């Protein structure tokens, strides 16, 4: 029930999945439980709305919300592999009850972007030789903010530039596109379906 | 009931028609239904007004609204073919219920502008040898925004610079102007009447 | 009842008159109706005030009498300065005046026609040679560059309602201290958009009274 | 009851007096009427306040000019006074008018003399010593055009001028009053009047 | 009950502790008493909130509030010692009843930053040879403001750039990290626990 | 009951004292009365608050003005083994703010300030600790900008603000107990005056 081979979708998923498996420690009398930070893809406004809904009277925070915010042509015979160098901007937004949690989270993200982070993405159509796509992801800025009622809620937003590739729709009917990529430790993971990565904000 | 030979009109139609035939897939139980995105030419404010009227109905979105937003002299014996190098700015505005639809639409637009897209337009007066006009259309910027009540509505706006040609009114009575152009796949289509391309916002 | 020999006035009139004779076609059952776009000289705010007054429907007598108001053009001076390239007046002082030409229209079509009659002559400038003669002396030759600086596009709504485009022009002209009307009226000619030597009319000839 | 020898005051008066004697023609049945535009020195806000006071129900009030100092600074090109300090003062000359016509007349009398500057040689003499010669460049910096409405109503143009002048510490009135002359717009040596001579009282 | 080995935490504590031991003289009939200015780590807004709560007495001011406000990659095989050059921004905010107190406080801070101040930080993991980390702290700006009801309250804020090092979380369980550093007089003090430095704003 | 040897304080006093002795003439029937313009050190907002308090009427509204209010508004390191004489080149910003009932008064006041700053004004400050050889400190004070504004109810009140950059020296607190610091400086006519206590220069805004 969606354009599976969407280039855009593939990038939202790739970025979501790099940040899909981040945990935070939380010492317990019985022992150290680690919780995975759930990640959503939604406009930030929408997310904050729903977050204030969910918030009205600690299992909800911490959480990450990713979203595309801008794109453009990437100024360095026909069009698609050879494809078009595009540049997408993402806003990764971390929400947290405690400064501690925030520190853990970012300390897991930040050190890999110097200021960039490379990943090699292999995307294969049906059964042809896969295409090799070189993806530079650059950490552009950080933005720090609070929100109060009484503790209440800490928000940090990282802005990332993904330097990727775009090309006209290749129908799902004409075969689904298999995708792999190198994670933060250069480990070739395979890009999961969208439903695998993002929690439903709905 | 309008200046048919209007230069401006010819450009609004040219741009409208490049984006006139865009569809989105929509998986059914019975099977994949494809729908053509209808396109209008109207001031953005006017269009949003009428859209909120119509909205008060998933047959309405997705839709595209095109409109001229600026122009100027294009700084690289009389005046008209040899004509005057003019530069027109258009705001192409896509409105959508689902992120998916949006992704499909843009993925059909974006990859052809690197950052420009050339088209050769042939305009012929009555029966003389047609004039050859070289038209550079440049994708300048993108702008992303939402709107909510409850889902509700996604808006992306591309801004395009059309580098075209202007010249004083050549009366309809003195013969109508036949127009052709190369589409996104360098296919010589012939520019339809205005009524053919744009749905009436009225 | 006004300083006829006003340099400023001469420029307002020159600009008014370049844009004085613009028409739009208007297809009928009977046949094509051509209408001249009336032009006024007034501050833009004042003009819009009066336009909202005129456009308002107070009697049925109005209703009909209202698409007779648009289209129309409103010209006005908005800025000036010294034009950085023994006494003072012919030889005169190089001045630079800025004018805002403002087109108001019910239909996009009308607008397209109007501008397509203005725009193509400014690349980005348009030259005119103005001859101004005092009494009966040999006339002065004044070289006038008019440059189209910018365009600005905007709408206004109630229900259709009203389209506004504003061109901004730089007139590169000449200034000099008041030469009294009593000392002889100044005859003025100029080359129009097709290099045709028309003679600059009185002010009352060019602009409709906004009053 | 004021520091007569004030340098500042001397400049406010010089500028006021350059624009002190401007008239406008006004055609009548009987015949042409000339009227001198009255000029005041006051903060613009104050002047507009008092102007709306005077305006409340009016044609003997406009046209009029209001001059005022708006800024100054050191003028980057053994002790301190003649030889004095090169200062730069900014003045806002503000013309208010009922009719566009009046405005046109007024400015057409001001504007053509500033290309973009206008020089004046000011002679200031202390008691009876040899007078000091001071070279004064006045530059027309900008113009600003605006309206105001109720019904016609009122047109406002403001010229901004840079006066390049000279400053030095207070020379007491008691130690002798300072005689001042200057070249007007036609290089005519007029003598700078008292302040009360130039400006109409806004009070 | 917190990530002890947090890099971020280590820097908040280092900065807190440089400014932890500032006093002001206050001449008495019985003789000069010196009071240590208490220091907190909290968002400035939060701190001002709580400060107005506490204020509604002269035992509360003077006080300093420190907080992180921004960070970024510091543009001069894996990642962590060798670590990533990061740059953190801190807002040190002094609140005072009397101009005098303020003068004393800043005169103790300001002269050491010309415009920078170096410190050598030794961080040792368990028992390995310690790591040597060179830390440049730069005084970026100062900001002066008042607040009134009647005297009432003086606020000055110094903005500091800490040029430090970042690396992915090293678990507390894998051994706590011993930290020392050179203070303002090049004296090797050892970085205390967080609870030692900052007064609880809670 | 303060840090007497405060570097900051020393500069606030130096600046206050350069502008401490400014008068205006005021012609009378008997004869010309001169009045010294009182000077305060306080945040501008605070000063205007208190000034509106004092100004709330009848006929003790003219003994209040004219007056000057000085205040520090910014500082920074002055980019041209330990730290203190040799000290650290600092740069302080001061806002000198003149309030006046009559344009005349204002003219007199500024005409006494303005001509000495071209655009700077140098002063040599000698600061001596106890009885050692005094330190020589070269102080450039630069007039940065002027700002002109009014305020009305009916006349009412004229405000001009000069912004000055003092290029001075900073160093860590030298305790009052370890000996008070004697300070002299060259005034506007290069006359070596000695910097008074703070209480001598500024009227209490309190």
Q: Measured between CB atoms, does C28 come within 8 Å of chain B?
A: no
Q: Name the closest residue on chain D to residue F155, using Cα atoms.
A: D46
3-state secondary structure of B53: helix
CA angle B106, B111, B114 (to 5 degrees): 130
Contact between D158 and D94 (Cβ < 8 Å): yes
What token pair was written down for C79? 């800025």
What is the H or E stretch that residue B196 is in? helix B194-197
* Residue count (chain C): 211
DSSP characters over D18-81: HTSS-EEEE--SS--EEEE--EEES-HHHHHHHHHHHH---TTT-SEEEEEEEEEEE-----SS
Contact between C203 and C142 (Cβ < 8 Å): no
Q: Please state, in angstroms and rounded to a whole number, the distance separating the CA atoms of residues B109 and B158.
A: 10
Tell me which residue of F168, F147, F166, F169 sits closest to F158, measured CA to CA: F147
DSSP characters over chain C: ---TT-HHHHHHHHHHHHTSS-EEEE--SS--EEEE--EEES-HHHHHHHHHHHH--SSHHHHHTTTTT-SEEEEEEEEEEE-----SSSS-EEEEEEEEEEEEESSHHHHHHHHHHHGGG-SSEEEEEEEEEETTSPPEEEEEEEEEEEEEEEEE-----EEEEEEEEEEEEEE-----GGG-PEEEEEE-TTS-EEEPPPHHHHSPP--
Report DSSP state, residue B5. Answer: T
Q: Assign residue B165 a region (left: φ > 0; alpha: ψ between -120 and 50; beta: otherwise).
A: beta
What token pair was written down for B158? 């591309």
DSSP characters over B98-130: SHHHHHHHHHHHGGG-SSEEEEEEEEEETTSPP
Question: What phi and psi, each to the nearest 5 degrees, are found at residue B103?
Answer: -55, -45
3-state secondary structure of A111: helix
A83 contacts in chain B (CB < 8 Å): 111
Tell me which residue of E78, E176, E83 sits closest to E125, measured CA to CA: E176
Question: What phi and psi, each to the nearest 5 degrees, are found at residue F13?
Answer: -70, -45
* CA distance readout (Å), D138 to D121, D124, D135, D173, E120: 11, 17, 10, 27, 60
Contact between F74 and F92 (Cβ < 8 Å): yes
Q: Do strands E116-125 and E177-182 pair parallel, antiparallel, or not at all (unpaired)?
A: antiparallel
Cβ contact A139–E73 (<8 Å): yes
Interface probe with E: pick from A111, A160, A182, most Cβ of E within 10 Å = A111
Chains E+A touching (3+ CB pairs under 8 Å):
yes
3-state secondary structure of E33: strand
- Residue B67, strand partner residues: B91
Q: Please state, in angstroms and rounded to a whole number, the distance separating the CA atoms of residues B82 and B92.
A: 30
What token pair was written down for E131? 């790591």
The boundaries of the domain holding residue C205 are 2-211
CB count in 10 Å sphere of residue C124: 15
Contact between B62 and B44 (Cβ < 8 Å): no
Contacts of A89 (CB under 8 A, 6+ apart): A68, A69, A70, A71, A140, A159, A160, A161, A162
Q: Please state, in angstroms and rounded to a whole number, the distance separating the CA atoms of residues C100 and D147.
A: 15
Q: Name the closest residue on chain F to residue E29, using Cα atoms.
A: F1
Per-residue HEC secondary structure of B10-32 comes to HHHHHHHHHCCCCEEEECCCCCC
Q: Measured between CB atoms, does F140 come within 8 Å of chain D?
A: no
Peptide bond connecting D133 to the previous residue in cis, omega within 30 degrees of 0: no
- Cα atoms in the Cβ-side hemisphere of radius 13 Å centred on E96: 23
Distance from CA of F108 to the nearest CA of D (A): 7
Count CB pairs under 8 A between chains E and F: 61
Contact between E165 and E86 (Cβ < 8 Å): yes
Cβ contact C6–D104 (<8 Å): yes
Interface probe with B: pick from C21, C22, C107, C119, most Cβ of B within 10 Å = C119
Q: Of E6, E72, E172, which has the smallest distance from its Cβ to A103's Cβ?
A: E6
- CA-based radius of gyration for chain F: 18
What is the H or E stretch that residue F200 is in? helix F198-201
DSSP characters over C112-172: HHHHHHHGGG-SSEEEEEEEEEETTSPPEEEEEEEEEEEEEEEEE-----EEEEEEEEEEE
Tell me which residue of A198, A40, A6, A43 sits closest to B101, measured CA to CA: A6
Tell me which residue of F149, F154, F109, F142 sits closest to D69, measured CA to CA: F149
Interface probe with A: pick from B103, B152, B183, most Cβ of A within 10 Å = B103
Q: Measured between CB atoms, does B144 come within 8 Å of chain C?
A: no
Q: Measured between CB atoms, does A141 come within 8 Å of chain E?
A: yes
Q: Of D104, D112, D142, which has the smallest distance from its Cβ to C89's Cβ?
A: D112
Chains F+B touching (3+ CB pairs under 8 Å):
no
Distance between start and end Cα atoms, chain C:
16
Cβ contact B103–A9 (<8 Å): yes
Q: Measured between CB atoms, does E82 come within 8 Å of chain A?
A: no
F3 contacts in chain E (CB < 8 Å): 25, 100, 103-104, 107
As for how many domains chain E has, the answer is 1
E170 contacts in chain A (CB < 8 Å): none
Contact between B130 and B122 (Cβ < 8 Å): yes
Contact between F111 and F98 (Cβ < 8 Å): no
What token pair was written down for A35? 């919780």
- Residue E98, strand partner residues: none
Q: Name the closest residue on chain D to residue F163, using Cα atoms.
A: D73
Distance between start and end Cα atoms, chain D:
16
Report DSSP state, residue D130. Answer: P
Q: Please state, in angstroms and rounded to a whole number, the distance separating the CA atoms of residues A135 and F66.
A: 69
What token pair was written down for C138? 């040999």
Chains C+A touching (3+ CB pairs under 8 Å):
no
Q: Of C109, C119, C157, which has the smallest distance from its Cβ to B3's Cβ?
A: C109
Q: Please state, in angstroms and rounded to a whole number, the distance separating the CA atoms of residues A126 and A171.
A: 12
Contact between D34 and D23 (Cβ < 8 Å): yes
* CA distance readout (Å), C138 to C131, C132, C141, C196, D40: 10, 9, 9, 20, 43
Cβ contact D172–F25 (<8 Å): yes
CA angle C72, C78, C79 (to 5 degrees): 150
Chains E+B touching (3+ CB pairs under 8 Å):
no
- Residue C129, strand partner residues: C143
D169 contacts in chain F (CB < 8 Å): 111-112, 115-116
What token pair was written down for F144? 């940065």
D31 contacts in chain C (CB < 8 Å): none
Instruction: Please report, for the domain that includes residue A186, its CATH number.
Output: 3.30.2000.40
Report DSSP state, residue F28. Answer: -
B139 contacts in chain A (CB < 8 Å): 72-73
């Amino acid at each position: 029930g969606y354009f599976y081979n969407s280039s855009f979708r593939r990038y939202a998923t790739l970025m979501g999945d790099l940040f899909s498996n981040i945990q935070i420690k939380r010492q317990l009398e019985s022992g150290d439980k680690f919780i995975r930070v759930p990640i959503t893809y939604a406009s930030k406004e929408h997310f904050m709305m729903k977050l204030n809904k969910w918030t009205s009277i600690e299992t909800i925070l911490p959480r990450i919300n990713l979203h595309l915010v801008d794109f453009s042509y990437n100024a360095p015979v026909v069009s698609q592999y050879n494809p078009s160098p595009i540049k997408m901007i993402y806003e990764l937004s971390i929400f947290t009850r405690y400064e501690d949690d925030m520190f853990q989270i970012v300390e897991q993200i930040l050190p890999y972007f110097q200021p960039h982070f490379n990943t090699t993405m292999y995307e294969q159509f049906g059964n042809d030789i896969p295409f090799k796509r070189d993806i530079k992801i650059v950490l552009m800025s950080a933005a720090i903010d609070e929100a109060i009622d009484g503790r209440r809620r800490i928000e940090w937003s990282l802005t990332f530039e993904v330097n990727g590739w775009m090309y006209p729709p290749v129908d799902d009917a004409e075969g689904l596109i298999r995708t792999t990529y190198t994670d933060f430790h250069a480990n070739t993971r395979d890009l999961p379906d969208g439903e695998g990565v993002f929690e439903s904000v709905d």
